[PDB]
Design a binder for this molecule. Structure first.
Ligand SMILES: NC(=O)c1ccc[n+]([C@@H]2O[C@H](COP(=O)([O-])OP(=O)(O)OC[C@H]3O[C@@H](n4cnc5c(N)ncnc54)[C@H](O)[C@@H]3O)[C@@H](O)[C@H]2O)c1
Ligand SMILES: NC(=O)c1ccc[n+]([C@@H]2O[C@H](COP(=O)([O-])OP(=O)(O)OC[C@H]3O[C@@H](n4cnc5c(N)ncnc54)[C@H](O)[C@@H]3O)[C@@H](O)[C@H]2O)c1
Ligand SMILES: NC(=O)c1ccc[n+]([C@@H]2O[C@H](COP(=O)([O-])OP(=O)(O)OC[C@H]3O[C@@H](n4cnc5c(N)ncnc54)[C@H](O)[C@@H]3O)[C@@H](O)[C@H]2O)c1
Ligand SMILES: NC(=O)c1ccc[n+]([C@@H]2O[C@H](COP(=O)([O-])OP(=O)(O)OC[C@H]3O[C@@H](n4cnc5c(N)ncnc54)[C@H](O)[C@@H]3O)[C@@H](O)[C@H]2O)c1
Lengths: 334, 335, 335, 334
């Protein structure tokens, strides 16, 4: 059992912790770090507006939280220099605070005694970036120490494009993600760096930018220059849909598009990408463990222009992708 | 004063009524029909969850409703055969029940006394179909008697497509409309013809078909077999966005794409199609009278693949188009 | 294995089905009736916007549905006369269409082969009415054949009232329940018997009557003519709160009020009434099996005026009570 | 025309500005102060998720915003010591930032050259507190310089209780306000001082505390000790309902309760309190100018226990109350 620490016990920190309990046999979270007191932190772990009440008991004291009788040590250091992971014999830190996506800031956790860092977001200056099931077999135990799990949206779209480019060829593709609101949006009209994310999120469709499409190139180099896109934030609390419209030189049919996805989405890869012929809505993919759930019924073909649509739980699915990735790093030398 | 009656006084019905009071100096609704009593009708007219309280005063009695002191006759007739438009000298009927989209049923209103019928929806077997500002000049006062105003989505998309086809040439386009939920959806999970519109509307992204992309051919023939799409119904009560992604053989940039729209978004056409660089969100286009408001900031190019995005108040934006059209019909031969 | 059938496989229907699979070792639904086809039914059973995807596998054919490999017969019979429960040897029927709340209609199920009928609602002309945990010991296996499980609100309020009346003595109480919206409300502004339930459910606080406060007498006679109230339907899909404000002649404090509930919220009764000091919000009581979860932190006293607040998952909380009751009926004479 | 400044151009600052344009003939806002840049501020004034697009044109430059051709000067001083109102000849400042509800902090605006301050919230150490239409005739031009408009909820409930106590006598009353969420709540589950306001606001009913009931005593001294209450935050973006349940020694009927409210809600007072026999929902009282809209249909009587219900637009109605109050201060010596 490889021990793990989390820096940043927020939505994604907490999803990850839950995913470890629910989905892993060889990982154990033994310390976290956050800004807030253990009463608040334990309360947020216990109750959850999306995921429900946690199965286990939760107690806290002035320097820990105890979950199902297992003591997790908690800190609150705004500066990760001020931590010590080797104390707790932690081999992997998940950096999920969102304020250390620069790999050269993140390597501090190595300084502070860890052996591997995983960034739960797009990173900069990272040793490598991964969408598990796409480019995971390039992981290099020697030289990939500070690594990125990419973004939710990237983890949805990359699996689907790997498959579609491989069989048909994508000349150019433009994406729209119709996306659950996220917590960096305002509940009432208030100031934001971004004048649209500034608007009341639960009564609006809010267009916003995403690097998720350009970032595919990091995991599918052959697609650099070939994808762009953006997001429509819409009033559901979780669950999103990536809608890609692209050009193929190929001559393609709804049926051949769908058959390729189906053909591909098997064995281990099929745990990252699913194939569905069902009448789905967002609530149907809440708490779904695939990174990309492909909706055969939404495939449209017009001339040499294709539209395909894949679903994702932008919390849980992304987390599960990250967990696969952590498991991999944990299975190799370290 | 051309006189107007309304069959089906629901969302679009009532939007229309208000649009007339706010925006027209030569039209008057003098009668309306639905499936309910005048207490229920007077209430729904007075209080609207989207459009607010109505300015005017509202009284009812056992066969009518009065609004700023003007008596409006009301009927409760499931079947339009049993209606007498001529009793009130109604020229134009807005058919907005969404149950008489076959013009062959809707021509009943003619028999029942009306000279014209305007179906506020995609229709079948109609004399003609109009997106105002796009193909309204081909209106034939003699032969065009039962006509379609097309869908909200088609009123959004067409203005935009015309312009960009005219300038650059569309090979093929695929559309996604992110659309406010509508009456035909279920509040709770419950049976429905469409197994997705069957799911809780206000907590779901709900994909469903729409033919508004194919329906563009009806108003721009040169685009037949060239456009398709679908909708995602989402939890807002009104406001939608039309997302189109097309190929052109032309060589294009974000700037030139946007320059085309801004060039054309002027004069009378600019009252149907608008050009914006503002940082819009859906609540900003609620009660906006344009059929299509173009979001210049959302435009993207990659190779010969282009993405463009236009907003529309699917209730009020659509209704303002339908009124423009009703104003055209009424500016001409009423025989 | 007592066999069970369900008339009306809607929200509460399907909650019930799941409650049986999750929570019972001696019950089995073997047949259900509704107004739809088995494709639509199998879909709505498999995917739920609140309860999530069902664990088991689901197949259908032209007269049934199969769930973890157990065949369940399905009928599409508007009229229960045309039903044959005995064909499948069903003892207990859950009548959950919300269209057969008169026991005189619902006794049809008896004629149609059933020995008992449990109406999942306030009923009229019923043999008896039960809030489990409150007055379920007065169940008469011979004479109580068509029975009510009362409303969700009454299942929330009664446990709580009993306790506080028993300890302090209620003069009069007035209740407000802040309740998740329900199927009988409109998604868009549209005609309805109730002119407020007629308004857009998911963007409105909607006041409406409920008799759950008066209905408490049926299960606690000593409170007749002593309680009243109303509901505010608000935009969540499930989860509600019952707010009661009463007089007592006793002298009371926040602490003693709360001490009464905690004292009583134990053993079997504690499975209906819960005691919490947690910082609850509505999503925290979704999928909670208690009929009434008491929020100790919400309690207020001013003179002899007391305010108390209890939570309830109006779908799943209510359904767990209805199952307790169905479990009681089935532990006894089935003649 | 009395000139006015606003400190704090947020929800309530902006509602107030709009109310001046829409409802006043003898007030002119000529300066505001806020944290943010004029581009962001002008954008928020222009577009509004609740109130709609503003009727007028809006331009901005590096030190002002211009509305319908009228230049409003804008500042951004975190510390109101750093301002000068007499420069712009401002007679009344509305303190609406929410971080100067202490009257001894607020009197700075007087230091900085103003003559009257109005706090748009419960205050501490204030010269007086007012619910216009209840205790406004006690305003003392000489000695009421730093004053409070009370809270939205107080402005709903005080008018209704003045009437009901006067005719029936309230022994004791407990309130629940079913309240639109406010912007001090979290959009996603995140830390808050208050563990319930910490929870996703648009998918929850969130119980929270309010002083609004105890505060009635400030405007109706005869009711001290006699009222308490709390709030249920619910997912509508504006519009709320005060539900009061109380004891009367009197012997009362639905009909006599309603007739008293109706009887009272006339002339000027009836502009603060309305009487309604209509089938209202929250959206019906959006943008309603009364502080309290009394819902006759919701009156319940059981023994000597009464429940009455009054609506309020917790943004706009409260604002309009505040505007009446400002108009009063503006009509007297100053
Ligand atoms: N849809 C999603 O939510 C989603 C999906 C994929 C990736 N991501 C990415 O994952 C990351 C996690 O974001 P989140 O949604 O969990 O955010 P969140 O705000 O909900 O939670 C993050 C937590 O980090 C804590 N924090 C902030 N600064 C800190 C610091 N210096 N030290 C320690 N703790 C600190 C906060 O208190 C908060 O509780 C972000 O980079 C985000 O972009 C989010
Ligand atoms: N976003 C929009 O709402 C939108 C936009 C464009 C077009 N439309 C189309 O306009 C039509 C009306 O839509 P709506 O949103 O007003 O729906 P709606 O349900 O609000 O309007 C229908 C009204 O007509 C009444 N009605 C139904 N059947 C009737 C009958 N047989 N005879 C008389 N009255 C009858 C109903 O009771 C209701 O009051 C639909 O076809 C719809 O697709 C809607
Ligand atoms: N919060 C709750 O939902 C709640 C709580 C307690 C009690 N109840 C009561 O339970 C009853 C059912 O409520 P629901 O929420 O499941 O509503 P629902 O509409 O979800 O359930 C009704 C189902 O029965 C079907 N049906 C309708 N008429 C029928 C008929 N004549 N014959 C056969 N099937 C028919 C419908 O198609 C639907 O599938 C109502 O009386 C309701 O008041 C509901
Ligand atoms: N329902 C309501 O919204 C409501 C009703 C009645 C009273 N109130 C009260 O009125 C006050 C106004 O709150 P709001 O809802 O407008 O809040 P808000 O956060 O929506 O807007 C307040 C604005 O103040 C600005 N601000 C913060 N600190 C500042 C400072 N030091 N200097 C200058 N500007 C500063 C912020 O940038 C923000 O834009 C609060 O005390 C609130 O409790 C609110």
């Amino acid at each position: 059992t490889i021990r793990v620490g989390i820096n940043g016990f927020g939505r994604i920190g907490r999803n990850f912790f839950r995913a470890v309990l629910e989905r892993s046999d060889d990982l154990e979270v033994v310390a976290v770090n956050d800004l807030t007191d253990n009463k608040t932190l334990s309360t947020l772990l216990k109750f959850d507006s999306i995921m429900g009440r946690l199965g286990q008991e939760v107690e806290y004291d002035d320097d820990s939280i105890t979950v199902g009788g297992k003591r997790i040590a908690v800190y609150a250091e705004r500066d990760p220099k001020n931590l010590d992971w080797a104390a707790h014999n932690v081999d992997i830190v998940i950096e999920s605070t969102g304020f250390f996506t620069d790999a050269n800031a993140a390597k501090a956790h190595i300084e502070a005694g860890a052996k591997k860092v995983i960034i739960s977001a797009p990173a900069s200056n990272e040793d490598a970036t991964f969408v598990y099931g796409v480019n995971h077999e390039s992981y290099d135990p020697e030289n990939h120490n500070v690594i990125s799990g990419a973004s939710c949206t990237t983890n949805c779209l990359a699996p689907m494009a790997k498959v579609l480019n491989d069989k048909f060829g994508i000349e150019n593709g433009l994406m729209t993600t119709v996306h659950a609101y996220t917590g960096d949006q305002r509940l009432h009209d208030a100031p934001h760096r971004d004048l649209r994310r500034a608007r009341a999120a639960a009564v609006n469709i809010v267009p916003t930018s995403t690097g998720a499409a350009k970032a595919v190139a990091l995991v599918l180099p052959e697609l650099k220059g070939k994808l762009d896109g953006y997001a429509l934030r819409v009033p559901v609390i979780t669950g999103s849909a990536t809608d890609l419209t692209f050009n193929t030189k190929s001559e393609v049919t709804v049926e051949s598009i769908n058959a390729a996805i189906k053909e591909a989405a098997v064995g281990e890869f099929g745990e990252t990408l699913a194939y569905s012929e069902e009448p789905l809505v967002s609530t149907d993919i809440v708490h779904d463990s695939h990174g990309s759930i492909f909706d055969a019924g939404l495939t449209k073909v017009s001339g040499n222009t294709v539209k395909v649509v894949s679903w994702y739980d932008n919390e849980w699915g992304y987390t599960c992708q990250l967990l696969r990735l952590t498991e991999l790093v944990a299975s190799k030398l370290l």
